[PDB]
Amino acid sequence: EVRACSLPHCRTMKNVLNHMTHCQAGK
Ligand SMILES: [Zn+2]
């Protein structure tokens, strides 16, 4: 989840789909 991310890139509009696409935060 972009909300749980620590990157300034993913932190934009909260596009979780855009974050998980490159970041790890499944289940
Ligand atoms: Zn991220």
Curated annotation (Swiss-Prot):
Where does this one sit in the cell? Cytoplasm; Nucleus
| Residues that hold Zn(2+) 1 according to the record | 5, 10
Q: Which residues bind Zn(2+) 2?
A: 19, 23
Please indicate which superkingdom the organism of origin belongs to: Eukaryota
Query: How is the protein modified post-translationally, according to the record?
Result: Methylation of the KIX domain by CARM1 blocks association with CREB. This results in the blockade of CREB signaling, and in activation of apoptotic response. Sumoylation negatively regulates transcriptional activity via the recruitment of DAAX.
Disorder named in the UniProt entry: Chromosomal aberrations involving CREBBP may be a cause of acute myeloid leukemias. Translocation t(8;16)(p11;p13) with KAT6A; translocation t(11;16)(q23;p13.3) with KMT2A/MLL1; translocation t(10;16)(q22;p13) with KAT6B. KAT6A-CREBBP may induce leukemia by inhibiting RUNX1-mediated transcription. Rubinstein-Taybi syndrome 1: A disorder characterized by craniofacial abnormalities, postnatal growth deficiency, broad thumbs, broad big toes, intellectual disability and a propensity for development of malignancies.
Biological role stated in the UniProt entry: Acetylates histones, giving a specific tag for transcriptional activation. Mediates acetylation of histone H3 at 'Lys-18' and 'Lys-27' (H3K18ac and H3K27ac, respectively). Also acetylates non-histone proteins, like DDX21, FBL, IRF2, MAFG, NCOA3, POLR1E/PAF53 and FOXO1. Binds specifically to phosphorylated CREB and enhances its transcriptional activity toward cAMP-responsive genes. Acts as a coactivator of ALX1. Acts as a circadian transcriptional coactivator which enhances the activity of the circadian transcriptional activators: NPAS2-BMAL1 and CLOCK-BMAL1 heterodimers.
Subunit: Found in a complex containing NCOA2; NCOA3; IKKA; IKKB and IKBKG. Probably part of a complex with HIF1A and EP300. Interacts with GATA1; the interaction results in acetylation and enhancement of transcriptional activity of GATA1. Interacts with MAF and ZCCHC12. Interacts with DAXX; the interaction is dependent on CBP sumoylation and results in suppression of the transcriptional activity via recruitment of HDAC2 to DAXX. Interacts with phosphorylated CREB1. Interacts with CITED4 (C-terminal region). Interacts (via the TAZ-type 1 domain) with HIF1A. (Microbial infection) Interacts with HTLV-1 Tax, p30II and HBZ.
Please quote what the entry notes about the protein's domains: The KIX domain mediates binding to HIV-1 Tat.
Protein name as it appears in the record: CREB-binding protein
Q: Which organism is it from?
A: Homo sapiens (Human)
Q: Its gene? A: CREBBP
